[PDB]
Design a protein around this ligand. Structure first.
Ligand SMILES: CCS(=O)(=O)c1ccc(CNC(=O)N2CC3(CCCC3)c3nc(-c4c(OC)ncnc4C4CC4)ccc32)cc1
Ligand code: NA
Length: 259
């Protein structure tokens, strides 16, 4: 590579993110004052466990859809073979959402954006997975302290997804080359903006893997309680990425084909 080529990659990644960020940061901050009432928290707590799981599975899917769109728009992703594209999204799309989540987290009152308003851990008690919720919250709290810029998230999420270590990749060297360019792009931006300090403060890759495995773990617990609910009321893309053996229907495949 060259210095010019690397700077072009920074802007290409940032553009790709701006176009696929789901909600604009400005729209998220303006809403921080809009918080659920005590009666509205009771309302969420009074809802059934299956209803809460269904609503949560639907929002995770919508967030994943934008992460798929980000991958398609990512420099060098569509050039990779179909197998590697799918391995990279199956293993990383969930992790990209988990990072993007801190944008909708307010560390001041310990609230997250959910269905038009801001709520705390209490709003998700009906789910019956208080450990996963607390984990998502602490992880969001941790990244909030870093005070990420939209460009920084754009470049970091690009690397999260483009990982050569992912098990099952056919063209490892091709991903190793893509990762190396994105590494440089990210490090160049951080160097230019005097933000090299956050590198040590970044969460270890093992923590992202832990939260993903924790989701699947609590999902199978819920699946054993309401199998017909996962079968009839859960999104097809969610089922493929997390439910076993819901991997039968290939939704990601069609998502990548068109455009
Ligand atoms: C993402 C791009 S963005 O533009 O910044 C953006 C856009 C929309 C929203 C709305 N909220 C939302 O989607 N929410 C809220 C919360 C956070 C914590 C509690 C509930 C949650 N959680 C999950 C989630 C999981 O998030 C990664 N991981 C595992 N399980 C779950 C489900 C609770 C079972 C999945 C969506 C989800 C927020 C942010
Ligand atoms: Na934040």
């Amino acid at each position: 590579a060259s210095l010019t080529e690397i700077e072009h990659l920074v802007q290409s990644v940032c553009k790709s993110y701006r176009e696929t960020c789901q909600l604009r940061l400005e729209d998220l901050l303006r809403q921080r004052s809009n918080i659920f009432s005590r009666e509205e928290v009771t309302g969420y707590q009074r809802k059934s466990m299956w209803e809460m799981w269904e609503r949560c599975a639907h929002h995770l899917t919508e967030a994943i859809q934008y992460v798929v769109e980000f991958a398609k728009r990512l420099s060098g992703f569509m050039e990779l073979c179909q197998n590697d594209q799918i391995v990279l999204l199956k293993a990383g799309a969930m992790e990209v959402v988990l990072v993007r989540m801190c944008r909708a987290y307010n560390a001041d009152n310990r609230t997250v954006f959910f269905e038009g308003k801001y709520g705390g851990m209490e709003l998700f008690r009906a789910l019956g997975c208080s450990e996963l919720i607390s984990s998502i919250f602490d992880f969001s709290h941790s990244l909030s302290a870093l005070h990420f810029s939209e460009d920084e998230i754009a470049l970091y999420t690009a690397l999260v997804l483009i990982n050569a270590h992912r098990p099952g990749l056919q063209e490892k060297r091709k991903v190793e080359q893509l990762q190396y360019n994105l590494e440089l792009a990210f490090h160049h931006h951080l160097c230019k903006t005097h933000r090299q300090s956050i590198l040590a403060k970044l969460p270890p890759k093992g923590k992202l893997r832990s939260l993903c495995s924790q989701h699947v773990e609590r999902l199978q617990i819920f699946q054993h309680l309401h199998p017909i609910v996962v079968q009839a009321a859960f999104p097809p893309l969610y089922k493929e990425l997390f439910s076993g053996g819901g991997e039968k229907h290939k939704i990601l495949h069609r998502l990548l084909q068109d455009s």
